[PDB]
Design a protein around this ligand. Structure first.
Ligand SMILES: NC(=O)c1ccc[n+]([C@@H]2O[C@H](COP(=O)([O-])OP(=O)(O)OC[C@H]3O[C@@H](n4cnc5c(N)ncnc54)[C@H](OP(=O)(O)O)[C@@H]3O)[C@@H](O)[C@H]2O)c1
Ligand SMILES: O=C1C[C@@H](c2ccc(O)cc2)Oc2cc(O)ccc21
Length: 320
């Protein structure tokens, strides 16, 4: 269904969203078809990023569902993200305008700082030196946020937020001198094996929505995810609750987040699963079942973004 949460700037965010990242080996055209099917199934919140190299396709999909009259622009909540190669203040608006041009949309509903570690400016999203290590850059993320705030001023992003920020980095933005807009959200990995209780409580404490990514246990694309990590959707408790409720493990995992106050994303380029995942609104977990899923917490982070560790801004060294 279309139920939403009110953000701290007064905009409304659909509580279920459609993830659009797919591994590099997935052809770009598949993003176009999956996003159309997502909108037909009921999805109104759509999550992309300049990193995903799909905004031309995702924009084509959204504007085709507008053109055929299925939805109007105001019904769609579209998220993009500012990548690490344009953290520098003077490059922030160029990057947003470049996403909008690829999308052929006048504005995004939500613009996020994608990841707090900066890299060398340029066309390459992961620039590398001769020994294969990332060419990091040195940027004041408070200066980045101010340039992101100016993007809201200009009406090019209706809301603004962050992703992959730990509590320290959230506090750096929240307590910045002259802050215009708080982040409306922190988009972070969250699933029953990494349920982010502490970070979720902290966001709640500052009127920041936690948006769960990798909520079904991630794409598991090598070399980003350890292939020896456990597979979330094989979990016996999730599978047992799925049987009990006549649902699926993915649907238990998404319902879990909805009942604990989290906005949840779900990626699928599969028509059946796309349509399946919107069924998260048709059933309820009992409080005893929520507690059983709470017990699944394992400290298994699927997406470490290890290749960016080293700089002070690497977000996952802190406890949360
Ligand atoms: N740093 C960031 O901000 C960041 C990082 C990671 C992700 N994200 C966002 O969050 C989204 C979701 O995370 P994710 O891409 O890691 O994936 P995910 O939502 O955790 O799960 C995707 C995987 O689960 C499968 N799946 C989907 N629905 C299913 C169902 N009902 N039953 C069984 N399997 C199902 C997908 O396969 P099929 O496609 O074949 O269904 C795919 O293999 C991303 O697309 C992106 O929008 C953001
Ligand atoms: O799966 C990953 C690993 C990594 C990454 C993905 C693609 C890429 O081109 C470079 C890095 O960061 C991410 C950020 C995202 O928002 C979504 C997925 C991933």
């Amino acid at each position: 269904k279309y139920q939403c949460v009110k953000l701290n700037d007064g905009h409304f965010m659909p509580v279920l969203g459609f993830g659009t990242y797919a591994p590099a080996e997935v052809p770009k055209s598949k993003a176009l078809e999956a996003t159309k099917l997502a909108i037909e199934a009921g999805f109104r919140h759509i999550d992309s990023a300049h990193l995903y190299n799909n905004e031309e396709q995702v924009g084509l999909a959204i504007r085709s569902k507008i053109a055929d009259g299925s939805v109007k622009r105001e019904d769609i909540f579209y998220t993009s993200k500012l990548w690490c190669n344009s953290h520098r203040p003077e490059l922030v608006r160029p990057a947003l305008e470049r996403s909008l041009k690829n999308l052929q949309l006048d504005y995004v509903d939500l613009y996020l700082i994608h990841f707090p570690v900066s890299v060398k400016p340029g066309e390459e999203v992961i620039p590398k030196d001769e020994n294969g290590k990332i060419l990091f850059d040195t940027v004041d993320l408070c200066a980045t946020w101010e340039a992101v705030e100016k993007c809201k001023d200009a009406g090019l992003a209706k809301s603004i937020g962050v992703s992959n920020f730990n509590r320290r980095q959230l506090e750096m933005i929240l307590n910045k001198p002259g802050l215009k807009y708080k982040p409306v959200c922190n988009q972070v990995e969250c699933h029953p094996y990494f349920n982010q209780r502490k970070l979720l409580d902290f966001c709640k404490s500052k009127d920041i929505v936690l948006v769960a990514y990798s909520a079904l246990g991630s794409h598991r694309e090598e070399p980003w995810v350890d292939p020896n990590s456990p597979v979330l959707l094989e979990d016996p408790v999730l599978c047992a609750l799925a049987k009990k409720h006549k649902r699926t493990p993915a649907l238990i995992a998404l319902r879990y987040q909805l009942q604990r106050g989290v906005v949840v994303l779900a990626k699928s380029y599969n028509e059946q699963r796309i349509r399946q995942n919107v069924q998260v609104f048709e059933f309820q977990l009992t409080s005893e079942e929520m507690k059983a899923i709470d017990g699944l917490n394992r400290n298994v982070r699927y997406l470490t973004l290890d290749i960016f560790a080293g700089p002070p801004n690497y977000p996952f060294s802190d406890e949360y």
